[PDB]
Paper text:
BipA (TypA or YihK) is a member of the translational GTPase protein family, to which translational factors EF-G,2 EF-Tu, and IF2 also belong. The translational GTPase BipA regulates the expression of virulence and pathogenicity factors in several eubacteria. Full-length BipA can be subdivided into five domains. Beginning from the N terminus, the first four domains are homologous to domains I, II, III, and V of EF-G, whereas the last domain at the C terminus is distinct and protein-specific.
To evaluate the significance of the bound cations and to resolve the long, disordered, polar region, we set out to crystallize a C-terminal fragment of BipA consisting of domains III and V and the C-terminal domain in the presence of magnesium ions. This fragment of BipA crystallized in the P41212 space group in the presence of 1 mm magnesium ions and diffracted to 2.5 Å. The structure of the C-terminal fragment is similar to that of the corresponding part of the full-length protein structure and to the C-terminal fragment of V. parahaemolyticus BipA. However, domain V is rotated toward the interface of the C-terminal domain and domain III. In addition, nearly all of the long, basic, disordered region is now structured, and the position of the [Co(NH3)6]3+ ion in the full-length protein structure has been replaced by two proximal magnesium ions. One magnesium ion has supplanted the [Co(NH3)6]3+ ion, and the other is close to the pivot point of the rotation of domain V. This placement of the magnesium ions in the C-terminal domain increases the positive surface charge in the proximity of the conserved basic C-terminal helix essential for ribosome binding of BipA (29). The isolated C-terminal fragment of BipA adopts an even more compact unit, occupying a smaller volume in the presence of magnesium. This observed compaction suggests that the C-terminal superdomain forms a functional unit even on the ribosome, similar to the superdomain structure seen in the crystal structure of EF-G bound to ribosomes. Modeling the structure of the isolated C-terminal fragment into the structure of the full-length protein results only in minor clashes between domains I and V. The presence of additional magnesium ions in the C-terminal domain increases the positive charge near the regions of the protein predicted to interact with ribosomes.
Numbering used by the authors: 304 to 549, 551 to 603
The structure:
């Protein structure tokens, strides 16, 4: 009985092997196979691609801890987004739901409830002790829960407790649950990101990196405020060049969003990957160049 699946792939980024010792198709397959010896829950299929394996676990959490200590072990790899495994029960198609149990200071209770609300979660139990904390229990589709561990930890300032586990399958919620609405900012080249470019770009959305970040072509470097994707230049600037042509301000950069693995997984769409190394997490389009992406969308 498995509930979520994703693809574990060899890291083909221009940066492969620069951060983790273990990068082979062989080494990854060997390591997955080894995991299957003590993980009853886990399923690993070879695919029509020698560099890609479809991995299925009890849920996203289980896949993520596996990715996380492959990281620790020196592995480099790319993963596709966690997809829930729909199942046809009777005639209707249904999706997995989890039970989440939370324990929070009352101070955080409103925010946490709101957030789970927004992720299509259903209040089942609410139980204050009289000492300032409160237990909540929700039932939420797996699809909507992905990403919440990190949200919860941040919004609770690390004081909250969270436990989630597969409950059951039920009729599918409607819509783009867990699905990013915005577009991404994609780097058009390889090099060192500079503040003079980032300064202009941060007007366009929210950046994932800052001055001095080493970047390649196809790497996703931020969130676009509009729904469409933007191929941008973060190696040299144009905004201040334009500013002097009227006014001038001082270059000040908003701190970048730093994303946990779980968040990177929540964020990416079908055409992207999370690049994962022992010391770094990156996001990229599957097709690294703008030329490739254009070709894909055309017929
Ligand atoms: Mg998503
Ligand atoms: Mg989108």
């Amino acid at each position: 009985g498995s509930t979520v699946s994703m693809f574990f792939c060899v890291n083909t980024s221009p940066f492969c092997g620069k951060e983790g010792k273990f990068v082979t198709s062989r080494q990854i397959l060997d390591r997955l196979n080894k995991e299957l010896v003590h993980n009853v829950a886990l399923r690993v299929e070879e695919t029509e691609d020698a560099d890609a394996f479809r991995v299925s676990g009890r849920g996203e959490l289980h896949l993520s801890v596996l990715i996380e200590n492959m990281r620790r072990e020196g592995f480099e790899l790319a993963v596709s987004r966690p997809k829930v495994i729909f199942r046809e029960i009777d005639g209707r198609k249904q999706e997995p739901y989890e039970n989440v149990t939370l324990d929070v200071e009352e101070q955080h209770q409103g925010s946490v409830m709101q957030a789970l609300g927004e992720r299509k979660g259903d209040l089942k139990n609410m139980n204050p002790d009289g000492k300032g904390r409160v237990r909540l229990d929700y039932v939420i589709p797996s699809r909507g829960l992905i990403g919440f561990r990190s949200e919860f930890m941040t919004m609770t300032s690390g004081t909250g407790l969270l436990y989630s586990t597969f409950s059951h399958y039920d009729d599918v919620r409607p819509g783009e649950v867990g699905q990013r609405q915005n577009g991404v900012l994609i780097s058009n080249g390889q090099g060192k990101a500079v503040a003079f470019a980032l300064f202009g770009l941060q007007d366009r959305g929210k950046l994932f990196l800052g001055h001095g970040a080493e970047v390649y072509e196809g790497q996703i470097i931020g969130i676009h405020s509009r729904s469409n994707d933007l191929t941008v230049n973060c190696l040299t600037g144009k905004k201040l060049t334009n500013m002097r042509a009227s006014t001038d301000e001082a270059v000040v950069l908003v701190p970048p969003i730093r994303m946990t693995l779980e968040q990177a997984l929540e964020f990416i769409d079908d055409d992207e990957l999370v690049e994962v190394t022992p010391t770094s997490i990156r996001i990229r389009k599957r097709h690294l160049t703008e030329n490739d992406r254009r070709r894909a969308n055309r017929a």
